[PDB]
Ligand binder design. Structure first.
Ligand code: SAK
Ligand code: SAK
Ligand code: CL
Ligand code: CL
Ligand code: CL
Ligand code: CL
Ligand code: CL
Ligand code: CL
Lengths: 149, 148, 152, 152, 152, 150
């Protein structure tokens, strides 16, 4: 159900400044994930996006959704297994139906809601939304392949 | 509420030393409630510590001092970016600080400061930092606002 | 309106700055039609510290972002030409992204070339599609709809 | 136990890393009693981008941090001597901070000297107090309690 | 010993890391004789934040550094071949630099090509000289002497 | 003036983080010599890569700090402490020669730049000297620069 940063670090190979999931609040195998990233001014991204107007990049929202969806796919098949995690990689083949509705800014808790749309073998198609305070800020569908590292 | 854009117009602190994201409550000469989001995507966590992200205790205090500073700026001159842009903030004293619970990525670090005493530019504040309604830290501090 | 633009000119048009300005040079520009630009990929970028240790792969979403910035440069200059003063008052936003395909990984040493074509434009609304290429090969494809909005 | 330690020795004892390793050299050390150490202050530090633009002032809270790290080096080597294999699985938590006064701003070009004395220690819990100094003058006073803990 | 090496190979031979690994790819290598390598130059490098605001220019001294690293890669693979096991036990020290000329500024979007030849070598001491080139034009010249030393 | 602090250096040199490599000027004699320094601390980004577990201040950046000191000397010799004119000038370094590194520089070192004017003819300034740590010569270099409009 709940995974904290330490758990996340053992599953995902992403490190600073490209690990964009802070906590997993909900996880149903083969079904859905709810996770989040806290948004703060204290992030290097905001130096350039943009000067005097801090806006969390929309592509990094999608990236966070992908990272959530990849975590869903991996743990669905192998559970919380750091040893297997090092032998596998989840890369993203496609991204589709992306819509941005509301700008994300420092102070926002950026929540990722992804469900498994379909899966066959190592090909997993996830989809859902990014949410701040109950509102949809973005949506996206993503297709991942799981492979050997 | 004051948002990051408003905070930037008052506090002189910038990246990577601006440690308040939003002001939720402000009562002139009385108290302030504010917060900073804690995320893994912060440079500090590279060194504090490897494989063990713990938000530095001294930076909790700094975030409290900045919250106190916002309260000080605005109690003094109201929301005035023009006056603000000439000033900086010096730490004078820190006392009676206790850390109870570690602060980690995914935490909403909420600052609760009240005015203990003030005179001119010298402001003494005290209160707590909280995560999910729990006190993670206590501190008292005195800061001075000065011309740049 | 020129067809070649260097970083000096890109900085005057785009509001993006480090570490989110992801276009280094523009090699072809045809108003309301197309842009060919590129970003150099080097190990000396902070992004590779995290993506990934011992295995530097340029993030696919940053390829898309770089395509969007190229598209945004094209959109603005198609309407106002090289006008830094007005550029300073405008900002281009992503509305949608569709049909994104990652074909080949991008790595240090690569010259990431953005090829964007104008699919539709009406006023401030611009639909662009195209590819990111390395040494003549398609590494990514994307379509996006952008909005030229007020900065304030 | 030696009395002088260099950055290599510090790295082998303290768990802190960039951008939070704030002790550069140890000049004297008496086990269970005192430590004198220092950190060089240069404009070439990332903190100075934010504290403050056009007026670089080394943050007071980081002076306290460096004093704590000095006490933590003293604490560890007093416990286990110079043992990097024991050290690499330890971390250090701040417990309390009291009676800190900042007297003089610290700026680029300063050699920030930490002088800590052990006020009380019991097991992993070390209470140190002292001063930070620049050119023989007290820029800061501080009392603090830190706990050494096994990473778990 | 092959002729082309990519970033993952360079990582395994050179001890340099971010932000001081300034070679992205090796295109040509003749043991004990010469090397052609390059670094891509992008705006997305932290160094351009300070060199200079509103005018990105790749520092001349860092061009020399990239040439030394190219020389160092040549030096090591000449003596040990592609041996990551032994590469881990070594660093490189600059001993001398001579005859350096800066002819053309290097900017974002440039492919910085390093051409170095061995002038003299004995044991760990390697003397190299050559040019840095962008689009076939000489941007810089330098001679340098380096030593491969045991990490101890 | 004879002594300049970081505030003054920022107003004369266009260099900024992470390429401003002079922290303070302790001596300045117009047309003759400059003594300046940069503090070396582990808390610098360069040390992440140069090298892991063995922090060594890059030799090329010693030379760079010497060049910066030479440029400050040249500029202040021509116009003194003038931030307004500073914004309109560049000091372009054309050549570097006779550089030798004797002792590695590490966190905790006070890197002192000793530079003197070797030749000044029109826009061309030729400067040379040493970098020192605790009175010992750690590096030496000669440099030639040209004054020009920004
Ligand atoms: C351990 O090696 C890795 C790790 C990754 O995160 C990734 C990878 C390889 O490569 C993935 C990829 C990207 C593009 C492509 O055409 C084929 C695969 C993208 C990715 O996220
Ligand atoms: C006080 O005036 C100075 C001093 C310098 O050292 C320098 C300078 C101006 O400006 C030079 C410069 C060179 C090229 C450019 O596009 C912008 C600035 C770099 C330099 O080292
Ligand atoms: Cl965006
Ligand atoms: Cl702490
Ligand atoms: Cl990717
Ligand atoms: Cl302070
Ligand atoms: Cl240069
Ligand atoms: Cl060196």
């Amino acid at each position: 159900s709940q995974f904290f940063i330490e758990h996340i670090l053992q599953i995902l190979p992403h490190r600073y400044p490209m690990l964009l999931v802070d906590r997993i609040t909900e996880l149903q195998a083969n079904q859905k994930i709810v996770a989040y990233k806290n948004i703060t001014f204290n992030e290097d991204v905001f130096n350039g996006h943009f000067p005097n107007k801090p806006i969390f990049p929309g592509v990094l929202i999608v990236e966070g959704m992908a990272q959530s969806g990849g975590f869903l796919a991996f743990t669905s098949l192998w559970g919380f297994d750091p040893e297997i995690a090092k032998t596998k990689i989840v890369y993203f083949m496609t991204i589709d139906k992306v819509k941005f509705r509301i700008p994300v800014t420092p102070g926002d808790r950026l929540e990722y809601h992804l469900e498994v749309l379909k899966h066959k073998g190592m090909i997993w198609q996830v989809g859902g939304t990014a949410q701040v305070d109950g509102k949809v800020v973005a949506e996206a569908e993503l297709k991942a392949m799981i492979a050997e590292r």
